[PDB]
Each structure stands twice: as C-alpha cells, then as structure tokens.
C-alpha cells in the first residue's frame, strides 16, 4: 500500500517541511499532486524510476528526490500561503496494466501568522423531549464551533465503545466567515437512539473532536493557550423519564 | 494534448434508481482508464480500471464502458444507495509511452438520497448538556425531496443535511443542524426557507 506523512499539517509562512510518502508493492512509478477547490488534481512532480525524477505542471516551490523505489519525498523549502491544499501521492508499476495507489492525503495549511490557528469549543446537546414523545427516539447533537484550520476527526463513544450506527457528521465543515479565506470552522454530528437507552441514567455518552494544530516546538507570545494538536470533548448521561 | 471532462458535475438522485456517470476524453489514444472514489477528509479508492482493449469492467453494481473510437466512458452504478455518496473522478494514461502522465476530470460530486418510507417533519430545540442557556434546532425526519437553504440572518447557521441509520431498527432519516450565536434568539426560525406545511414546530418549553 502507499503510506503518506503526516496526515495534517501547519506551516508557518517561510517554514521547511517535507512529506513522505512510501510504498512496499515495488513500484517504479511514484508521482505528487495537490489538489485545490474548483480547479481538481494536479501534478507536481513524478519518477519513473530511482535516481531519476521529473517536473508537473506545477512544481515550482517543491523539490523531490528518488534514491529508493520505495519511497518519494516532497520537500518544501520557503513554506507559501498558496501552498496551502490537499496533497496526494500515487504509485503504480511502469508496466501498465496494473492500476495507480492513491495515500490518504496530507492537508497542509499554511499561515502568514499562526495566530489564525484556533481549536474548537465542543459541546453535546441533550435530546428534546417533544422528539422522544412524538418519535421514542432521542438525537444527541454535538457541535464544535471557531476552529482552524479545517484539520479534525469527529468521533462519538457510548459506553467507551465508538458508535457508527444512529450517526451522520457534516462531511464538510461550514464556515463562521463565509467571504474570508481564513475563515474559523463550525462542525456537526448527530447521534440517535431509542428513547428508553436515553432514559437510562448509566449509559454514557461522549464526543470528541481530535484537532490538529501547532506543536510543541512553535512559537506561542499570547494570554491563551497555544492550540497544539488536541482532542476536545463534550459529554451526556442518560436522564431517567 | 489530453483534456478530461466529467459530467454531470453534480449529481443528486433518489436511492433504488440506476445512475450513469460520464467521462470524455480528447485523445483516444490512452493505455487504459481508472475510477476512484473520494470521500471528503479521506484520499481516493480505485474502483475500476479499464486496459484500451477491453471494452467492458464489472465489480458488482459498478459497470465501466470504454468507446476509445469516440473518447469516453461510462460509469454504471446499478441500484444506488446514500452509501454510494461522493465524489467520482476518472483518469486517462497515456498509451505512447516514454510519458506515463495521466489527466484527471474534475469528478462528479453524487449524492444519493435515502427513502423516507414515513415522513414525519419536525423542527425540535435541544439544551446543552452544561446548562450554559444555549440551544440548538434540529430540523429532522423529511423526506428526501425538501432542500434546506442557507439563513439569511448574520448570527444564525445552518449545516447541511446527512442521513444517519439506526441499524438495530433498520431506520435511516435525514436531518439538518441550526443555531445562533445570539443572545436568546428561536432558532427554529432560521429553517424559514421551503419546508413542508405540516412540519411540526412544537414550543421549546
């Protein structure tokens, strides 16, 4: 398979990074795109093989490098805020016929001031008592407001056992500042069951937000605390009828 | 040189009905043709992946075509369902050779809707489990044809709509979050858009 680090990311204008991206199915072809909102995938750089490695489209600000057929490095060296995207590395065998393996991607943010990074408040809303009276169902919402950049993972627990059933979060965040590009972060879930296991004062329910921001290592010269990579949670007890 | 096209570009169709997706291509001369799909905040799975001389590709309900005399496939999706929902690119490859570069389509952003066998509208206010005064809408249970609009008020926020499915009593609805960031402010009034008559809006006390 193709593995791609890390997963998110932020950059301060002017900062170096590099993003790995390996591969142990013996590919010799092994390329990096970004893509962008409107304007889909396009190639930065590519490498037919090891030693060798070759321009995109568009692969001014990024350098690459092919010493091993198993991995491909995307080096950026003076970090830009136009390099901010959603970058993506694909392999596949120089013999056509066998498919191209797409990572996970690598959501790169980059800022002129880190500042603009916030982590989200988080907050579970307990179930109406017209819904559980009209449907004998109760919906848990849980919602995280005024984050950034867009880097989270929205997760519920019930019992300490993550859920998947009764549940559907935004698939997109909405944002607070429609007009701004730099624009805070606002995102939602919802968790439903039947009315009697809310009802049902021991049953514990959780959700929590995994926000990725700065580290350890940045700088950080304000009155609040610095938004390091974090999870933020919220929390409800069934309440008896 | 290669130019790949996807249409449509946005796709919104009722689950159980069979749904075609379309990509042309520029040049024919390509070694083979690949689908994936995308799910927002995740990378892109392969679906297909068609050789020049083929024709045909199954997995399932996904059919792939490929007419490389006129330059463009077809994606056949057979009976869909709101699993189906995301975004669909195909690539092309060169078959020259010397020039493995492939060229992406813009994709095709699907959305498959889930039947509402029982629609039951209704716009419910929930209290925060802190007790900080604050509240939440929760505009659930319509049929799938409604469409929720954006407020026009600076405060106020709407979500989209998503489908959540109760596996225990194999029941799916859909649902669409609203707030604001007002002092005391109804949020049930941000859904002022185009609902159903009959939605109940039943008083927060």
């Known amino acids: 398979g193709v593995t791609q680090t890390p997963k998110f990311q932020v950059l301060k204008t002017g900062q170096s990074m590099t993003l790995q991206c390996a591969q142990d199915?013996?590919?010799?072809?092994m390329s990096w795109y970004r893509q962008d909102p409107g304007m889909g995938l396009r190639l930065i750089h590519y490498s037919v093989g090891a030693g060798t490695t070759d321009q995109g489209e568009v692969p001014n600000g990024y350098n690459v490098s092919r010493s091993t057929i198993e991995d491909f490095p995307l080096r950026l060296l003076s970090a830009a805020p136009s390099q901010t995207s959603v970058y993506f590395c694909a392999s596949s065998y120089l013999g056509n016929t066998g498919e191209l393996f797409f990572g996970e991607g690598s959501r790169l943010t980059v800022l002129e001031d880190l500042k603009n990074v916030f982590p989200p408040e988080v907050a579970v809303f307990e179930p109406s008592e017209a819904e559980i009276s009209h449907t004998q169902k109760a919906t848990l919402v849980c919602l995280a407001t005024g984050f950034y950049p867009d880097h989270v993972e929205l997760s519920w627990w019930v019992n300490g056992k993550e859920v998947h059933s009764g549940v559907c979060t935004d698939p997109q965040p909405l944002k607070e500042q429609p007009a701004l590009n730099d624009s805070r972060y606002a995102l939602s879930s919802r968790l439903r069951v039947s009315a009697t296991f809310w009802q049902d004062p021991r049953n514990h329910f959780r959700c929590q937000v995994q926000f990725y921001g700065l580290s350890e290592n940045d700088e950080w010269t304000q009155d609040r605390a610095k938004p390091v990579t974090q999870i933020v949670s919220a929390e409800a007890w069934g309440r008896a009828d | 040189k290669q130019e790949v096209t996807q249409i449509p570009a946005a796709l919104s169709v009722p689950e159980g009905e069979n749904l075609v997706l379309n990509c042309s291509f520029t040049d024919s001369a390509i070694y083979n043709l690949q689908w994936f799909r995308q799910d927002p905040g995740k990378g892109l799975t392969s679906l297909l992946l068609?050789?020049?001389?083929?024709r045909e590709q199954t997995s399932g309900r996904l059919n792939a075509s490929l007419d490389k005399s006129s330059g463009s496939s077809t994606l056949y999706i057979a009976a869909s369902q709101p699993g189906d929902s995301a975004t669909y690119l195909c690539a092309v490859r060169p078959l020259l050779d010397g020039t493995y570069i492939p060229t992406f389509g813009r994709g095709t952003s699907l959305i498959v809707h889930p039947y509402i066998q029982n629609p039951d509208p209704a716009v419910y206010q929930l209290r925060d489990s802190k007790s900080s005064d604050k509240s939440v809408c929760l505009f659930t249970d319509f049929d799938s044809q409604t469409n929720v609009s954006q407020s026009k008020d600076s405060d106020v926020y709407i979500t989209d709509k998503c489908v959540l499915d109760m596996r225990s009593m194999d029941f799916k609805s859909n649902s669409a979050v609203a707030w604001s960031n007002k002092s005391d402010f109804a949020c049930a009034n941000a859904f002022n858009n185009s609902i159903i008559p009959d939605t109940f809006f039943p008083s927060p006390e």
């Open positions: 068609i050789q020049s001389s083929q």
């Open positions: 199915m013996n590919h010799e072809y």
